[PDB]
Amino acid sequence: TDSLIKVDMRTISFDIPPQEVLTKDSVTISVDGVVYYRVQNATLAVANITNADSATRLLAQTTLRNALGTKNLSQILSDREEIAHHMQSTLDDATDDWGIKVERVEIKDVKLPVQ
Amino acid sequence: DSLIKVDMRTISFDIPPQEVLTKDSVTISVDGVVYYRVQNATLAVANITNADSATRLLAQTTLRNALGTKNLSQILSDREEIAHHMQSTLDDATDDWGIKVERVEIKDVKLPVQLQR
Numbered sequence A: 001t002d003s004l005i006k007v008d009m010r011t012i013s014f015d016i017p018p019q020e021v022l023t024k025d026s027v028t029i030s031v032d033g034v035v036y037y038r039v040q041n042a043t044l045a046v047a048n049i050t051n052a053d054s055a056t057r058l059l060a061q062t063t064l065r066n067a068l069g070t071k072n073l074s075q076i077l078s079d080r081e082e083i084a085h086h087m088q089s090t091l092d093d094a095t096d097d098w099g100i101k102v103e104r105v106e107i108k109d110v111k112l113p114v115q
Numbered sequence B: 001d002s003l004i005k006v007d008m009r010t011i012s013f014d015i016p017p018q019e020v021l022t023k024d025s026v027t028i029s030v031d032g033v034v035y036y037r038v039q040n041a042t043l044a045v046a047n048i049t050n051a052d053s054a055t056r057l058l059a060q061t062t063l064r065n066a067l068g069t070k071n072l073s074q075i076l077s078d079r080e081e082i083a084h085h086m087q088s089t090l091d092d093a094t095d096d097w098g099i100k101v102e103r104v105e106i107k108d109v110k111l112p113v114q115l116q117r
Helices: A042-047 A049-069 A073-078 A080-098 B041-046 B048-068 B072-077 B079-097
Strands: A012-022 A028-039 A100-111 B011-021 B027-038 B099-112
Touching: A012 A049, A012 A100, A028 A049, A028 A073, A042 A049, A042 A080, A049 A080, A049 A100, A073 A080, A073 A100, A080 A100, B011 B048, B027 B048, B027 B072, B027 B079, B041 B048, B041 B079, B048 B079, B048 B099, B072 B079, B079 B099
Parallel strands: none
Antiparallel strands: A012 A028, A028 A100, A100 B099, B011 B027, B027 B099
């Protein structure tokens, strides 16, 4: 069926709002990020609009916190691509149930508050 | 006794975000606040052109210079000594214009992750 309702099938992005994280070397940081994704299955995505919108954003936040909590501050700067690619794999696993491919994750800013 | 009343108490201005490199080659974005007051009304009014030109730009240069001489770990730990050092540098320059820099505060320190080695 050539459905009348159509969905953007190309790369789009949402921001992960700043998450407060404790590094392995005990530094308190605020980290925000960007998730790049696209609908790969229009039928699954249309079926899961409510179940994916909320759940994906929260999972992006949790995925970030868990990944960064296991690293030293130094590692977060130098291993940023490894960390991001690991997050992308974790996020892409969960989003498949909702017809979404996560293509890329980027760690944006690491804020250091008054310690 | 004067009709025009120059504010003689603490005022603040913001130092716009400064992108700079640490001693250990980390790119950071840092901003701050400078708390000052007029201590000499006559001298400040006389040197108003000097103060409006130099002070804000001096706060920027002093911040950039201080952060370039510190390691990231030191910026995390010694944020108070850096601010106190800046206060002394700024206060030395503003004294000639009847202005006392009372306190410098380092607010946000961000690591643009995409912009590193």
